[PDB]
């Protein structure tokens, strides 16, 4: 069989790669990443707003 690709599930697949970069170099010796100040770091090359509904599907 072949393979398909939508548009709503491929965003969260590549977002996990750009998400571990703001949690590894900060939680080891500085503050702990939360769910408030991290909205700026995840709003760069994505140009899409991230809230709480996207967390329930992950």
């Amino acid at each position: 069989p072949g393979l398909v690709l939508p548009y709503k599930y491929q965003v969260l697949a590549e977002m996990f790669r750009s998400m571990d970069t703001i949690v590894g170099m900060l939680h080891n010796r500085s503050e702990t990443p939360t769910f408030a100040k991290v909205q700026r770091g995840v709003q760069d090359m994505m140009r899409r707003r991230f809230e709480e509904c996207n967390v329930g599907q992950i």
Binding site: S18, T21, I22, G24, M25, L26, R29, S30, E31, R40, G41, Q43, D44, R47, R48, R49
Partner: protein, 653 residues
């Protein structure tokens, strides 16, 4: 040498200390500089070598997304402790520029590489001792800068004992050599003062301040010392929101270690890379907001969409709210002349009868914008304005700044302007004529840029305002400052039984909506509201809060309206109709200020509807605004000769 995740009991500043794993890391970054593989496959890093040697710009930049995508196992080992990884990498760049360009060795070496676009940005308040010696990207507005300073870095001393002159020495603020362990195998002899054997090194210090956009009422600002070494010199200007990356390193003094017991304990930031931002903020916005603003702009009622949202606390005075929205854009300061730089800012001067709450209309525009300040009259003077002496601690000279320089490309709010001193009103004309100040102190001149829109609130002389007198004489202000604004729309409150039923009805409706107990079921509880929207005077729904935030950071930095040549000659002969009619009853004629200002409001309304060029529908609604403000500066008796005659011009759309 291959695997780097197995430190074997070592720390971060120990595994990359020897030359073991360095063999593979150095050979990987060296071959990648000449072999650049981007999207389509264009080697652009090879051409950048020949571009940095033309103007002797030793600042090789590189994108962080390129090094993080090719090596997924190296995107974390770099932001660890890059204090020693970038210093050793500078020697690798010298082996590349000299291998292909042998003529570059004639100039000085030690090329400091750069790095831009960092995935992390920290504010200037959350940094303490946990971020010590960490390359963190921190932005902020520049308060002041320093020019050339002859830093004592190497002083020659003539000695005679073994035919060896003493030197070079170390006396800079970075590191020094304390007496007791001389680098020349611990030797010392006679000294002799010279006069031409002293080679100084460039050294400048920059003041960093917080951005006024996140400053609330009831907070104290903080300062930050920024130390910049060589290479990156004169790269920033005072009063400009830029971006400078550096290492949060402590301060190592050398002047108080001979008398005091504790040295200067301070945390500064060194220089590594600069980035002058304005134009890059609109390119990094979201995508879902661009689609929703185009669906609402298709209607022909978007003009009154923002006029009904200005100050939703006091009802009435519709003509006042129209001038506040147009002054938020500030126009587009261009160069219409051929050698003279004509300013292009919309300056509005408000002055009403004390009793109608004139200062509450200004407290709303400062919260819906991105940069706005607020000052009084007796709280500042000629000193705390734009620039004013030295640093009397160890013989130093450092100029400072005021409040108009840091408020670049923003909206300034000045309260209590009529009670200002006479020596202060005659010194503010320099800042509101060229948007720049030439500080000529200590023989060092430096020009900057300060885009501001003066918004003041004056009061009549003594008691209340009297409409029987002219506006130029009713307020205790000079005459050269009046001919520098544009919108002079003033109002006079009086007892009117035909309209007093909406004032008492709107203040009691907003008293419950703006109550902290009512916000528990509205702001706290999502999906519920006690009172809906207030009945406006146009039947258009107002705007909440998030609409005005993403409105000025998009339309102002996207479409640039040009200057066409439509029926502009019709205004030429129309101006002559009022020029030879004003003195026929008793009024001053219209000067050339109302002619060159028509382009300001023409491009302001075209930016709302997103027009690439000016249209005739924008120049018509701009004449009714400049005429309604000029008639309020004369006598009420001559209003029947100007309004009835020019009734065809005050009725458009």
């Amino acid at each position: 040498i291959e695997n780097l995740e197995d430190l074997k009991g070592h720390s971060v500043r120990e595994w990359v200390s020897m030359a073991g794993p360095r063999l593979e890391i150095h050979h990987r970054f060296k071959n990648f500089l000449r072999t650049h593989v981007d999207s389509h496959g264009h080697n652009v890093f090879k051409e950048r070598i020949s571009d940095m040697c033309k103007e002797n710009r030793e600042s090789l930049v590189v994108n962080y997304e390129d090094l993080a995508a090719r090596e997924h196992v190296l995107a974390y080992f770099l932001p660890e402790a890059p204090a020693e990884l970038l210093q050793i990498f500078d020697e690798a760049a010298l082996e590349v520029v000299l291998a292909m360009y042998p003529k570059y060795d004639r100039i000085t070496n030690h090329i400091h590489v750069r790095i831009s676009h960092l995935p992390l940005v920290e504010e200037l308040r959350s940094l303490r001792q946990l971020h010590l010696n960490q390359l963190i990207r921190t932005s902020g507005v520049v308060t002041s800068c320093t020019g050339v300073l002859p830093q004592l870095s190497m002083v020659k001393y003539n000695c005679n004992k073994c035919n060896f002159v003493l030197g070079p020495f170390c006396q800079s603020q970075n590191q020094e050599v304390k007496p007791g362990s001389c680098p020349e195998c611990q030797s010392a002899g006679p000294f002799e003062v010279n006069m031409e054997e002293t080679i100084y090194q460039n050294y400048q210090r920059i003041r960093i301040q917080e951005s006024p956009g996140k400053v609330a009422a009831g907070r104290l600002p903080r300062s930050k010392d920024a130390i910049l070494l060589a290479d990156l010199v004169d790269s920033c200007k005072p009063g400009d929101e830029i971006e400078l990356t550096g290492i949060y390193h402590n301060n190592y003094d050398g002047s108080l270690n001979t008398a005091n017991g504790f040295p200067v304990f301070a945390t500064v930031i060194l220089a590594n890379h600069v980035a002058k931002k304005n134009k890059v903020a609109v390119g990094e916005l979201t995508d879902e907001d661009v689609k929703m603003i185009t669906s609402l702009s298709k209607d022909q009622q978007i003009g009154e969409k923002i006029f009904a949202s200005i100050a939703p606390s006091i009802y009435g005075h519709e003509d006042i709210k129209r001038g506040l929205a147009l002054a938020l854009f500030g126009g587009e300061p261009k160069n219409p002349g051929g050698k003279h730089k004509v300013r292009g800012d919309i300056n509005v001067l408000l002055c009403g009868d004390p009793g109608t709450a004139k200062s509450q209309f200004l407290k709303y525009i400062e919260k819906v914008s991105s940069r706005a300040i607020f000052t009084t009259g007796q709280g500042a003077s000629a000193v705390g304005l734009t620039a004013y002496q030295r640093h009397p601690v160890s013989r130093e000279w450092t100029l400072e700044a005021g409040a108009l320089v840091l408020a670049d490309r923003g909206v300034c709010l000045i309260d209590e302007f009529d009670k200002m001193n006479d020596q202060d009103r005659t010194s503010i004309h320099e800042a509101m004529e060229q948007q720049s100040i030439s500080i000529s102190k200590a023989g060092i001149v430096t020009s900057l840029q300060a885009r501001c829109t003066v918004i003041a609130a004056a009061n009549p002389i003594g008691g209340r305002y009297d409409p029987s007198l002219t506006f130029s004489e009713n307020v205790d202000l000079t005459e050269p400052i009046i001919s520098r604004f544009d919108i002079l729309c003033v109002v006079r409150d009086t007892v009117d039984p035909v309209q007093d039923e909406m004032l008492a009805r709107f203040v009691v409706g907003s008293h419950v909506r703006h109550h902290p107990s009512n916000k528990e079921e509205e702001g706290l509880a999502n999906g519920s509201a006690a009172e809906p929207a207030m009945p406006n005077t146009y039947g258009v729904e107002p705007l909440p809060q998030e609409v005005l935030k993403k409105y000025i950071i998009y339309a102002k930095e996207r479409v640039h309206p040009k200057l066409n040549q439509m029926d502009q000659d019709k205004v030429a002969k129309m101006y002559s109709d009022l020029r030879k009619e004003s003195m026929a009853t008793g009024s001053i004629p219209i000067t050339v200020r109302h002619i060159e200002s028509m382009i300001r409001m023409a491009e302001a309304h075209a930016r709302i509807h997103l027009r690439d060029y000016v249209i005739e529908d924008d120049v018509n609604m701009a004449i009714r605004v400049m005429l309604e403000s000029f008639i309020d500066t004369q006598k009420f008796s001559v209003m029947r000769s100007m309004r009835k005659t020019f009734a065809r011009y005050l009725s458009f759309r």
